[PDB]
Design a binder for this molecule. Structure first.
Ligand SMILES: [Mg+2]
Ligand SMILES: [Mg+2]
Ligand SMILES: [Mg+2]
Lengths: 97, 117, 205, 203
RNA sequence: CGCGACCUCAGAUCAGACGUGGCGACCCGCUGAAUUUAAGCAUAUUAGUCAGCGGAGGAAAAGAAACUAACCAGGAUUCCCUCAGUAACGGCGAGUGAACAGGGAAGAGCCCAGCGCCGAAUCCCCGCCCCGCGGGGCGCGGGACAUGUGGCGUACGGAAG
RNA sequence: CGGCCCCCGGCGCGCGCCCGGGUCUUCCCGGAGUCGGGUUGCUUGGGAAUGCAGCCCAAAGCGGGUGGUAAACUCCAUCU
């Protein structure tokens, strides 16, 4: 009982189940590439905006810690991923003692 | 120090890479044994030191290197600065020798910045 | 400056429009010019069909135009997979290839696989020297012509179904109403709101 | 796999290992002259991903551009028009400073064809760009058909037409709904074609 | 003290090449008004046009999606007819103003850095010759480039073993 | 329509260059003072900012851009 309006719209077809395009799996982790970033961050270190963040992130609050990263890293969807990986290195420093 | 560098550059001297002179006559002596014997495998492995940072770093991270000699006065340091931290994790023993041009004379070139057994 | 009952007009001539005027005086002379460029090209590719490769069947996107069928850019690289001809051999035999094309319907897929096997059906290749891999005899009694026109297999063929005559049966003449559309439209615009009201009712405890 | 480490070590330049040597050379670039021939790329990672190779016929200059916007070159700041054009001192010059670096590197060397350029430093007054040049009549560039496009006479002076990577970013071109102020070719070929009067022959 | 290797640099009427200047109708990059209109006049309009400056080429620029879409989906660029004087902008005044569908003209696709593999397997210059016109190629021999990475296969539509 | 001289596009002897496809398995896989954000000035029909630029801040890797009303959650589309 088809109809162009509602909740199951349109002319009904049957979907062609296929492999994704190779370009669409693009920004992936690929463990050799993960090795290069993770080895170099101990010979390079931490930026000064993300050391002042993690002295706020280990004692005081997380609401001033995300608001701080909001002012220095642009958006909100960027400033939580940064807030949650500074905190996972912070537990690999603190709780892994 | 200069005693340890000399014991090292002596051992790196008889593992010198192939110059173009002997490359000419190794391919003459290869064809004249195919004209003689037609062997399946004349040499099991020809031993040599690999030179070059993009060559060395592939060998360090596969742990196929024995000893990585790394230079001293490389003009941008960022070409080289990772590799002492990289040899420590992979378990390859590394050493800093004075002068990028002195181990570049092992390889018949001007500078070569890294050699590795 | 205006007068009695007329239009209120906005003529776009407040700019130096007389240096940018285009007069189509050469437009006869460019039509016979681009005819000669078709003729001098048709004999340069002399046995090959004029207007080039075979194009795929393509349905137009919008609510306005999705009832019709259009020639496309090329085949999706999965038709050539399923029809079984290589993608770097497809364009040298005369098949337009578009590698950025997706087929997310099986119906639209198999119509261009069938279109492509029907092309390879009525295709005759020419050897360099007569060795003929995957090829037979003399050129189909000398191929009945030399060059085709305005399409290999006439790309539109926008056909419609027969559906001869039915008897108006019960519950076909009863249910499927205008109220089927108005109940469907309110179920679209109240679906997200009601599922919020289900969460509020379950947290009563 | 060394150039993967040179790249990721460069993408962290607020770290104290990296901001040390990035201003021990910004000191050293400021003691030299305006345009100066480098003997080699100071960063061989970014150089060769922009088209550099280590062969006879590629040549690198670092040139220095003074930072900031433009002041309107008008005597005593008086522009004499309607008030919307009193803009002496807040104006910004819609071409980027890297494209200014590619230009006067290629303006000094007229026998050279400029490929593109990259960033190597800035302090407060100056900004530093290594500009990579191609000598079109060297027989290592005149041969090798991977490079013979630039020894062809329509590729003369690609910055005075804005055809490099830094040049074409100011032209605002691109495919998409954000970029059809230039929907045929360029900004003033879209302009001429929407603002011409196409009065036909049977009209 | 000296010798040497490099690294950064200088000099030469060094060997061999290249750039300059003209035209500028059309094309590209900048820069840029005011007359005028609003019945005055400031934003606006004129107009991103005139004038100024720099680069080309027989065409140039653009060009193989960090696209459009929202449905049974289309599929690089440029051009034409339409969309359209339309959505939109505007002392919402005077005025300004695109795009996607659709139909055509033409149609063509590709390359590298990276990622690893290959004994740098690559290139330039000079010396004489096999063979040559109207000269540039494979070969024979040193001096260079180059491991801070030449060449082979390799490209996101996947690739390699 | 002929006859005269000159200049071209492609037959066929000698160089030179020569493994392609399919399935399965294993492994590899990407451009940073850039994206983005804040502010400023110009530009646009682009309107809670279309584009461009200066300045300050400055990324990620199941990531990023876009989806034409700023914003948070979520699913999905699409490109790289
Ligand atoms: Mg040199
Ligand atoms: Mg005046
Ligand atoms: Mg009429």
């Amino acid at each position: 009982y088809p109809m162009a309006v509602g909740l199951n719209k349109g002319h009904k077809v049957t979907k062609n189940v296929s492999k994704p395009r190779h370009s669409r799996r693009r920004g992936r982790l690929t463990k050799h590439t993960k090795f290069v970033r993770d080895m170099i961050r101990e010979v390079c270190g931490f930026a000064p905006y993300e050391r002042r963040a993690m002295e706020l992130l280990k004692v005081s609050k997380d609401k001033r810690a995300l608001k701080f990263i909001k002012k220095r890293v642009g958006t909100h969807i960027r400033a939580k991923r940064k807030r949650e990986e500074l905190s996972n290195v912070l537990a690999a420093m603190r709780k892994a003692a | 120090d200069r005693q340890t560098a000399t014991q090292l550059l002596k051992l790196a001297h008889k593992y010198r890479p192939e110059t173009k002179q002997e490359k000419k006559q190794r391919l003459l002596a290869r064809a004249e044994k195919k004209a003689a014997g037609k062997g399946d495998v004349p040499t099991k492995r020809p031993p040599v030191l690999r030179a070059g940072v993009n060559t060395v770093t592939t060998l360090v991270e596969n742990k196929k290197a024995q000893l990585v000699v790394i230079a001293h006065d490389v003009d941008p340091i960022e070409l080289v600065v990772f590799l002492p931290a990289l040899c420590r994790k992979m378990g390859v023993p590394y050493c800093i020798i004075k002068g990028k041009a002195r181990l570049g004379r092992l390889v018949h070139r001007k500078t070569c910045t890294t050699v590795a057994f | 400056a205006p007068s009695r009952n007329g239009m209120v007009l906005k003529p776009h001539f407040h700019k130096d429009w007389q240096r940018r005027v285009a007069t189509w005086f050469n437009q006869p002379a460019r039509k016979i010019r681009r005819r000669k460029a078709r003729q001098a090209k048709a004999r340069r590719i002399a046995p090959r069909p004029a207007s080039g490769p075979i194009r795929p069947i393509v349905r137009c996107p919008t609510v306005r135009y999705h009832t019709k069928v259009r020639a496309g850019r090329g085949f999706s690289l999965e038709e050539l997979r399923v029809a079984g001809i290589h993608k770097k051999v497809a364009r040298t035999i005369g098949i337009s290839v578009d590698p950025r094309r997706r087929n997310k319907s099986t119906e639209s897929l198999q119509a261009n696989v069938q279109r492509l096997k029907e092309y390879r059906s009525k295709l005759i290749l020419f050897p360099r020297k007569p060795s003929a891999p995957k090829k037979g005899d003399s050129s189909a009694e000398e191929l009945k012509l030399a060059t085709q026109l305005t399409g290999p297999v006439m790309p539109v063929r926008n056909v419609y179904k027969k559906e001869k005559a039915r008897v108006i049966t019960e519950e076909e003449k009863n249910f499927k109403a205008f109220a089927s559309l108005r109940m469907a439209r309110a179920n679209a615009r109240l679906f997200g709101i009601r599922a919020k009201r289900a969460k509020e009712a379950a947290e009563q405890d | 796999g060394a150039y993967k480490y040179i790249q990721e070590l460069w993408r962290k330049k607020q770290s104290d290992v990296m901001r040390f040597l990035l201003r021990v050379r910004c000191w050293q670039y400021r003691q030299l002259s305006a345009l100066h021939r480098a003997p080699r790329p100071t960063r061989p990672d970014k150089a060769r991903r922009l088209g550099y190779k280590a062969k006879q016929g590629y040549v690198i200059y670092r040139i220095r551009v003074r930072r900031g916007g433009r002041k309107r070159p008008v005597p005593k700041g008086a522009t004499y028009g309607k008030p919307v054009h009193h803009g002496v001192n807040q104006l910004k010059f819609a071409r980027s400073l890297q494209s200014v670096a590619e230009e006067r590197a290629g303006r000094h060397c007229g026998a050279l064809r400029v490929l593109n350029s990259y960033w190597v430093g800035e302090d407060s007054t100056y900004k530093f760009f290594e500009v990579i040049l191609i000598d079109p009549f060297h027989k290592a560039i005149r041969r090798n058909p991977d490079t013979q496009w630039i020894t062809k006479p329509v590729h003369k002076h690609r910055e005075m037409r804005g055809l490099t990577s830094a040049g074409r970013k100011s032209r605002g071109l691109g495919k998409g709904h954000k970029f059809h102020h230039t929907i045929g070719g360029s900004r003033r070929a879209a302009w001429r074609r929407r603002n011409t009067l196409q009065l036909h022959r049977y009209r």
